[PDB]
Amino acid sequence: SGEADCGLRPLFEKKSLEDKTERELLESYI
Amino acid sequence: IVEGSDAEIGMSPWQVMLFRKSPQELLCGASLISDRWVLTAAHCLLYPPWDKNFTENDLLVRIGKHSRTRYERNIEKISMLEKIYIHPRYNWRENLDRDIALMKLKKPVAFSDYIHPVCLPDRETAASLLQAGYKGRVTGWGNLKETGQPSVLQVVNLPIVERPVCKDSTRIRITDNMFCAGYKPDEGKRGDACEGDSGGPFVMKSPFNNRWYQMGIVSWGEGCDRDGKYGFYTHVFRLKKWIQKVIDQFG
Amino acid sequence: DFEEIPEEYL
Ligand SMILES: N[C@H](Cc1ccccc1)C(=O)N1CCC[C@H]1C(=O)NCc1ccc(O)cc1
Ligand SMILES: N[C@H](Cc1ccccc1)C(=O)N1CCC[C@H]1C(=O)NCc1ccc(O)cc1
Ligand SMILES: *[C@@H]1O[C@H](CO)[C@@H](O)[C@H](O)[C@H]1NC(C)=O
Ligand code: NA
Ligand code: NA
């Protein structure tokens, strides 16, 4: 269905790799 | 997307391209929310002022894409539509209130490294993250400038804007079913959605569970990347009851 | 401007 693993990208979260700008989002979540 | 950058491979695996069959052209963005459901803006399918009223057989969805114009053999997957559902109170007459539509695919799509669904936010995730200053991410193959078109999917991160500033930026009537995002003139940085990005997702990565959620749908703006203007997005959580009703009933 | 897609989908 996709429910259990929604929002977890195969090439990023699933492998514990970060994309080049996701940190900018995190830094804004104050 | 104006003033964005090229997406990384697999960066937005829920990104969907709505593609017109004849003539073959980009119609809109969209997002994958399960193996058989795609979310987009209602104005991508129905906008009578521009004589737009698409039926299921007019369109295809292309999932897993990166290049705008190439047929990405062995990577992208192309699906036909079983049925379109437009919000019954979508206000195409005035201000694009409730600018949301769902598309059910004829067959489930197989997930891959390039094809994977985004989550939709619960009340608490929405309340925590839909705050002025918090940034989300918009993606699409739309125009690079207001007045050309990209080789590959574009991405821009943009801050949510305070509701009074959104309201004061426009003469169009805003509603609780919308939010706006973008930098202010004094913030220096730039970026916006534009024509062709319609229907694509505004996503945020929850810092609580490290999952991506779709908070918004690219809906409307006045020009693209203009100083003192902001992009407007359908507020996905506010339309949860309708989304769930459609999927629970049909599926 | 777009590359032709396989006929199976049209
Ligand atoms: N310019 C109009 C304003 C309008 C709003 C509401 C009612 C009637 C008119 C508009 O933005 N329109 C018309 C209908 C489709 C929509 C549009 O083009 N969406 C693309 C877009 C561009 C930039 C963004 O940031 C986000 C999305
Ligand atoms: N029952 C399915 C299970 C399932 C979940 C996830 C993936 C695949 C399957 C489901 O609940 N679904 C399907 C896809 C959409 C979702 C749904 O309806 N969300 C309602 C909702 C919630 C919060 C919002 O902000 C907006 C809307
Ligand atoms: C749009 O298309 C459908 C089917 O062709 C039709 O029922 C409807 O009246 C049309 N116009 C709308 C919804 O404004
Ligand atoms: Na105003
Ligand atoms: Na602006």
Q: Residue B97: which residues within 8 A CB-CB, separation 6 or more? A: B89, B90, B91, B175, B177, B178
Q: Domain limits of chain A?
A: 1-30
Contacts by B147-151, CB closer than 8 A, 24 or more apart: B149/B68, B149/B196, B150/B1, B150/B6, B150/B68, B151/B6, B151/B67, B151/B68, B151/B69
Atom 3 of ligand 2, residue of closest alpha carbon: A3
Dist. CA B179 → ligand 3 center (Å): 28
d(CA B31, CA B185): 30
Atom 10 of ligand 3, residue of closest alpha carbon: B53
d(CA B34, CA B74): 21
Determine the 3-state secondary structure of B28 from DSSP.
strand
Q: Count the alpha carbons within 13 Å of B244 in the hemisphere toward its beta carbon.
A: 8
- Least Cα separation, residue B116 to chain A (angstroms): 7
- C10 reaches B (C-beta below 8 A): yes
Angle at B175 between CA B173 and CA B181, to 5 degrees: 90
Amino acid B212 reads W
B82 close to B105: Cβ distance less than 8 angstroms: yes
**What do you get for the CA distance between the two ends of chain C, in Å?**
17
B219 in catalytic set: no
Angle at C9 between CA C3 and CA C10, to 5 degrees: 85
B184 close to B165: Cβ distance less than 8 angstroms: yes
Helix (H) or strand (E) segment spanning residue B55: none
Give domain A1-30's CATH architecture. Irregular (4.10)
The residue annotated as part of the active site, out of B66, B79, B99, B169, is B99
Phi-psi region of B227 (alpha: psi -120 to 50; beta: other; left: phi over 0): beta
Amino acid A22 reads E
d(CA C9, CA B229): 40
d(CA B169, CA B10): 35
- Least Cα separation, residue A27 to chain B (angstroms): 9
Chains A+B touching (3+ CB pairs under 8 Å): yes
Least CB–CB distance from C9: residue in B22, B69, B78: B78
d(CA B117, CA A5): 8
CATH topology of domain B15-117+240-250: Thrombin, subunit H (2.40.10)
Amino acid B165 reads V
Radius of gyration over every alpha carbon of chain C, rounded to an integer in angstroms? 7
d(CA B219, CA A22): 23
Least CB–CB distance from B116: residue in A1, A9, A22: A9
Dist. CA B75 → ligand 2 center (Å): 26
Length of chain B: 251
Tokens 């220096």 identify what position?
B188
Ion ligand 4 — residues with CB < 5 Å: B 167
Ligand 3 contact via B52 beta carbon (within 6 Å): no
Exposed / middle / buried, residue B134 (Cβ in 10 Å: 0-12, 13-18, 19+): middle
B59 close to B104: Cβ distance less than 8 angstroms: no
Q: Residue B60: which residues within 8 A CB-CB, separation 6 or more? A: B18, B19, B21, B78, B79, B80, B81, C5, C9
What are residue B214's DSSP bridge partners?
B203
